[PDB]
């Protein structure tokens, strides 16, 4: 419950006909992060050192 994925853009795909390079370029971009509402919340484990 402490973690939320702040969004802003979803995966969005855009095609640019590059033309010059004959290429067609597809760009998929998304803005998203993982943030914790509060600082505590996750404890991880580790193999020993």
């Amino acid at each position: 419950d402490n973690f939320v994925m702040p969004r802003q853009r979803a995966v969005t795909v855009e095609r640019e006909r590059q033309a010059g390079k004959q290429r067609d370029a597809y760009y998929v971009t998304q803005r998203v992060n993982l943030q914790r509402y509060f600082a505590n919340g996750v404890v991880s484990g580790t193999y020993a050192a």
Partner: protein, 51 residues
């Protein structure tokens, strides 16, 4: 004067190769051209006789 326009001579396309498929050279090289002009004008012949 008369100044007709003369089309320029032909360019050549560039045969791009296989590496240059995604690069900006995949479109070859510019077939630049420029018209050239010819100028037509007349000089004069005259003569006279009196009787």
């Amino acid at each position: 004067i008369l100044t007709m326009l003369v089309e320029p001579d032909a360019g050549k396309a560039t045969w791009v190769a296989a590496s240059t498929y995604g690069t900006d050279t995949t479109t070859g090289e510019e077939v630049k051209g420029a018209l050239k002009e010819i100028h037509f004008s007349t000089y004069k012949l005259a003569a006279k006789s009196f009787i």
